[PDB]
Symmetry: D2
Subunit: 217 residues, 4 copies
């Protein structure tokens, strides 16, 4: 058993949003089978960020999803060999982000490398004007396809002037070696910002995530 | 209270899919507060349909969703005045459908009028070739906006040879008179075809729908 | 023989936008081989319209596109048998419209029946607030697929306070009998409102449309 | 006057498609005011590429677009100060790519740095199975918005059997210093692969691009 009750992770992101380049480094920890993890991030280059932190938050840890016995945990089964994931986030005002990540296990610690490109965000929009107030709790729809696991989520960012800012997530989870695939199921998640300095250069996050079948099934 | 423990409904649909016109008439019944309803449909014109019945199934009854005390039931509160709903269904192979519906309570019985336009479906596709095997159970994400209630769902049609055919639903629920709006919540649903003749000209359906808050809230 | 140098048409539209139902009747005329036509419309029911006329304008005449000798005029060749077309218009603020039309030739005059459903237009938007100032001239991209002719356009509505309101058009042109298909080509078009009363219940339009190959070929 | 009749460029691309990382280096040349340029590429890492070269080809030179005297050449006027461009490519089978590029002028030679992330491409699709055979000639629709220039194109990749693979391009052109903006206009382009080795590790391209007003103006 390579995925222990307690596992630590290191994450590094290299990104670009509306032409602004940045680098983020971080360290995280959590309980893989209990469905929760924390992460501490630091902007190492391109700081302070001229956009909302919230668009970066869901990109900083697959192995921390609590899965019941009957639904195979594809993401956990991918280790020690390796794991990769990719995502497209379609924002309602035209913004589009594509993310690609590489996950490896080195000496009982997960190493995550994230590449992020965000484009077409309006200048007067909530992302560029930093008007977002965190994510609402979400429900991902997962299904197997092409030998990999795919997920779709209808997410929303809370606005300070009131209301929501809609984002559609489409994710593809790829194990290095094709491991056991689950059926049609759901993953409930909730990401919260627990700490931050004034310009969001140092941020701490907490995520709660649990996989399940549909309530009627 | 005009919405009783047992309510009946009449449905009338006028539609077009890939240039083929059709008319469907139906009668249904159910328990509004327990979250379940049945409906018997008959194709009255344009029969037999040269496409999958499944794309028409979710268009045939908002008042039948079980809601807990804490979440305002916008759809039930819209009566006896009136209710209207609109929807766009985006299929993964390019097929797009827009639906518009009118709802009124005429002497303890609901009268539903539906208009449907389906376009851009590939000729060798699962809808036109009738390769679908019913909907998977789903979870709608709802939120208030512009004084009305909106909802989005990531749905899927089961395929005969195995696999899924993805469809994204975006619905807008409009009360005639601006009634109380709920917050950010979810609606679980499961629609099943319970009876049908060989050419799907006489079809019976069953649906169970329940509104709830996110599991982590 | 059937498509004369001068041809007239009658059009009837039954529609719905954001729950509001309407009916429009009109008469038109033009020169098929010269690439121009005029049309006089009148709102017969649901008047005055609570939205911008501009979204309806491109739905009111395929046979009037000038084509050079080397490019097969699919739409003209579909007659006297029949023609049908479908369309989806995706607006940048979430508005979606699907249109379906049936074209017939009776008594030496074309008869057009249009069904229109418009959904998800924000209440504070330029369509519902009537802030649009006509269409910009456009260029459609056409290609054959599934035995029919398809077309895609990146169109824009001029704004009153300045700027543009973007709309993506995806059309499907279907002959009743499988007629000769053209290759990958373009159709330049410009639609102008030439006359209108205050509430847009009586409107006149003019369209110039010409088919051609890409200029670098 | 910093942009001469003959200008050379160096290009470097760091990218990822369906999890596969790659690095491409190249050198090109052309005549800015005449509207044509050539480029010689070499895959330096991640070679041989397990996907179609054609999706990379339009990412390898804004200053080589011929513009008439009346339409301001935003991209040429961006120099010596600098220029940046971003793009999203939406493929019809689900594939999404976001591109971000930085353009500088160093000692009479243009330096281009490109970052590419391609996600959600089907394993059995024409991109991953290398079944595409070049781009069709295209027409871009440009318009000013938020102090920058934006452009939309309906492009197509030719398929080996005798069909097309559709891709929608949405580009954003950003000068470092807010320079003169043009109006609503078009850019015709034609990209051809002129030379390639067996595995597409060494490729040569040619592009012809000209800006113009709509033909009906």
């Amino acid at each position: 058993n390579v995925i222990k009750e307690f596992m630590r992770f290191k994450v590094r992101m290299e990104g670009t949003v509306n032409g602004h380049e940045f680098e983020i480094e971080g360290e995280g920890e959590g309980r893989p089978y209990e469905g929760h993890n924390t992460v501490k991030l630091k902007v190492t280059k391109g700081g302070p960020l001229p956009f909302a932190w919230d668009i970066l938050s869901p990109q900083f840890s697959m192995v921390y999803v609590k899965h019941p016995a009957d639904i195979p945990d594809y993401k956990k089964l991918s280790f020690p060999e390796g794991f990769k994931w990719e995502r497209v986030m379609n924002f309602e005002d035209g913004g589009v982000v594509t993310v690609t990540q590489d996950s490896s296990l080195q000496d009982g610690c997960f190493i995550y490398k994230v590449k992020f490109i965000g484009v077409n965000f309006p200048s007067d929009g909530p992302v560029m004007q930093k008007k977002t107030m965190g994510w609402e709790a979400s429900t991902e729809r997962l299904y197997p396809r092409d030998g990999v696991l795919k997920g779709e989520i209808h997410k929303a960012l809370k606005l300070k002037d009131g209301g929501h800012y809609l984002v559609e997530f489409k994710s593809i989870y790829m194990a290095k070696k094709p491991v056991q695939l689950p059926g049609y199921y759901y993953v409930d998640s909730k990401l919260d910002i627990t700490s931050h300095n004034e310009d969001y250069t140092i941020v701490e996050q907490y995520e709660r995530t649990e996989g399940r079948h549909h309530l009627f099934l």
